[PDB]
């Protein structure tokens, strides 16, 4: 009993889409987050994924192509035009994700305001004291999660976030170490994303579902003699 | 998974019904499949083994109908309706449920011929052998039935069983009989210290052992 | 406690040479801090969080490692790099330092 | 179905030896192969299993790390490298093909090869010393083969003139060396009137002895 | 449906919990094969490449090249309070790489048709290493082993062939250059040596050529590839 996926039977030998669903031999299919598109037809040039005025995962098999829609994108209308053939007809499939302004739950330490990304919190590190260490806290407490957590650091980051993260602060005199985010939040499906706007590096990760236990971690951002750190806290149950 | 096959040897008569046991150490039954992961093999004398049965009773394409094996859980048995003189071989049991596949001990099939007494024959060491500095006496015992037999060596009446070479043969195709060769290895020195060398055999046929000796 | 072993004890090199020292830990450690000490002064923060360079530390310096094997590398050794270099861990109490690799010059 | 293996030789303990198996009469790339040795005690031990495309292998704890199975799907051959051999590895190794009808990595074996003999021994190959055995209704005669290494040794009587009524005996491990004998019973009229010649053959030492029996 | 291995463990060759051996499933994925599993993954992640994780289902594509016969991607399922393990690795074929090994180490995991130790060439020089391919259908691996910088990003980007007249040669995307679709790419690193290659399956529209540049210290080299059809 599956759902979400879309199947395009355009050959001979689950929402089913066929020739009837085309308009003037065009299929303006609008994919959603974590939605798997499937087609079964002999493509013209054995290839599709391009620009037409971004494929995370595409598997090309004989007379069959599987595509999973990505979870984060900033392009308004980034499309893919699978041009196929069946019988004596030529059909084209235009895939495009639903435009949604996903707001990154994190701290923008940079000062540029013409960024392609939107952060819930922000702290211009360039204004911070030299030889200082200011915090920018971030918290989450939803039953189910579908969020993007990251930061925009104009300088070096510590550690490699968010594949590696920094353990939370100890009340007693105990050390805090660097761990892999996989083990820290104790889930499997962790998407990772990286981007760069000039000197500003921006690294983030996606979380989907409900976490096992309420967990917290930290990521450190330094620029010249100034420094800062973002503390994240996600709640279970 | 320990595979046992009782008994070790099985004296059978042409045409009679024959059954072989194979006890397993663990269950071999996938409940959903309802198939037993066991197989039976036949190793003809002077020949490689050959698959007969797989699963519980599923025989292979080309296997005779008389071979009817059946079992479940840990008990497994191979039954033959009418024993042909051709299929007198060592039958093996094997599990292929989980790694590693383990085999069985095997049940040899012998022919139940009329109990035959052996014809013993002694041989003194050859002149050429003495020259090299050694002397061994060979006592031949062949064409007898059953297998059970005890041979004794008498060095001038004294029982010295040290340094004896006893070899047995399989069921002779012609007469379904067994043969044994006992060999008493000695040095030339000790050999010349004695005169008469006796060889006697204790077989089921006679209470008094059959003697055959020579005096140098 | 965690023993931090620094090799070589004395690292003599000519200007321009690519050199690398090694900090081998008894057990696994998640990070190693690096400090440079020149005679007459206290240690100075040099490499932060295994690979990040402290403010003013020239780009020729580099840190790399994980587990029980970390390192510090100088691409083109300059005369001013002659000093003793210490590696520091704190993955478990107590915080321990290294014996110290002394960078010596050649003439 | 043609399963013919070769490569068995006397190997010194600790040494290695790779034996091969030639597949023919079936789609080699579609069936998984296995090696199964048979000890002189007529015991069957599984040696190794390889997948159709030589990506997965299986070995029991006995030979794990010592033996290494392999196959050349193009050359239609199955290889078995045996390192650090031990006296226990002295067996008759058989090349077998696992059943593919049931889609499962572990299964029984459809067919079996002829067999190639391995003998992990540190002894020196010595030639045999043949000794005649001369002594009623029927006169028996013999021929002893003592002090030889290794197996096998071939024997026949009068170049194969007579076969019935003859009994050869298997070799026995006597004082680091093998030893066997044969028995030929003839009518009293035929001996010593006719000459009976014991025809021995030790290939491992290329010796041909044809001693006649003289009383 | 002709190249799908389906393993049904939830509620086109369909395997079920019977093909498992001691709850293990060794899967030999042919280069032209797909694997779709239906189960509830224990940690929802797997495969210790191109994989797609969708809800209670997972699909994996076979990689063209495999370095060690032991490398494998392992999934663990939990159906009816029982644990089943699926080991997936491609059929082990030691394919050769049609390219030039510029490195000097000989204990590599990769085999190249041509080779040219760049360490031996003169400083401030630029020596060529040509590799040609001439088959109707292709199923080959083309790459290089450079101990230093590689120009451009090969083989996703490549360098146009030399112009007879005085025209410049530019950097293009390989997909456009050879004009085929599912070009698989692969990278590797042995110490300092970089191993970048690309696969090629099927025929080719037009005979075309390209170049990839490898420099080390003051020494330099370049590999020119040429593939033909029609
Ligand atoms: C896993 O699958 C096996 C085999 O079923 C077949 O193969 C699969 C790969 C799929 O393609 C299936 O669609 C396909 O049907 C199942 O084993 C089978 O179980 C039934 C009982 O449930 C067996 O029936 C028995 O048959 C014997 C012999 O005639 C009778 O004596 C019995 O009384 C009973 O009727 C059937 O033979 C058996 N098949 C095999 C090849 O062993 C298995 O149940 C299934 N398991 C799960 C958990 O799904
Ligand atoms: C595609 O549709 C046709 C007609 O509806 C049908 O006969 C055929 O089986 C379908 N093929 C697949 C792969 O679903
Ligand atoms: C797949 O699994 C479900 C489990 O409920 C079963 O009902 C179905 O028959 C299975 N199908 C195949 C082809 O194994
Ligand atoms: C290749 O050889 C070089 C020789 O300088 C060595 O440094 C390197 O470790 C070798 N690579 C591997 C993978 O062994």
Author numbering:
A (entry chain A): 182 to 194, 200 to 239, 245 to 428
B (entry chain J): 2 to 217
C (entry chain C): 1 to 107
D (entry chain I): 2 to 136, 143 to 222
E (entry chain F): 183 to 193, 200 to 236, 247 to 428
Provide the authors' own sentences about this structure as they appear in the paper:
One of the most promising candidates for inclusion in a transmission-blocking malaria vaccine is the gamete surface protein Pfs48/45, which is essential for development of the parasite in the mosquito midgut. Pfs48/45 is formed from three domains, with N- and C-terminal 6-cys domains joined by a central 4-cys domain, all linked to the gamete membrane through a C-terminal GPI anchor. Indeed, antibodies which bind Pfs48/45 can prevent transmission if ingested with the parasite as part of the mosquito bloodmeal. Here we present the structure of full-length Pfs48/45, showing its three domains to form a dynamic, planar, triangular arrangement.
Insect cell expression systems were available to produce full-length Pfs48/45 ectodomain, or to generate a protein containing the central and C-terminal domains, Pfs48/45-D2 + 3. Three of these complexes generated crystals: full-length Pfs48/45 bound to 10D8; full-length Pfs48/45 bound to both 10D8 and 85RF45.1; and Pfs48/45-D2 + 3 bound to both 10D8 and 32F3. Datasets were collected to 4.2 Å, 3.72 Å and 3.69 Å, respectively. We attempted to determine the structures of these complexes by molecular replacement, using the structures of the C-terminal domain bound to either 32F3 or 85RF45.1 Fab as search models. In each case, the resultant electron density maps were sufficiently detailed to allow us to build a model for the central domain of Pfs48/45. This domain contains the epitope for 10D8, also allowing us to build a model for the 10D8 Fab. The most complete electron density for this region of Pfs48/45 was obtained from crystals of full-length Pfs48/45 bound to 10D8. The AlphaFold2 model was therefore docked as single rigid body into this electron density and was rebuilt to fit the density. The N-terminus and loops 62–68 and 163–168 were unresolved. This model was then used to guide building of the observed portions of the N-terminal domain in full-length Pfs48/45 bound to 10D8 and 85RF45.1 (95 residues were built) and Pfs48/45-D2 + 3 bound to both 10D8 and 32F3 (20 residues were built). In addition to visualising antibodies 32F3 and 85RF45.1, our crystal structures revealed the epitope for 10D8, an antibody with weak transmission-reducing potential which binds to the central domain of Pfs48/4512.
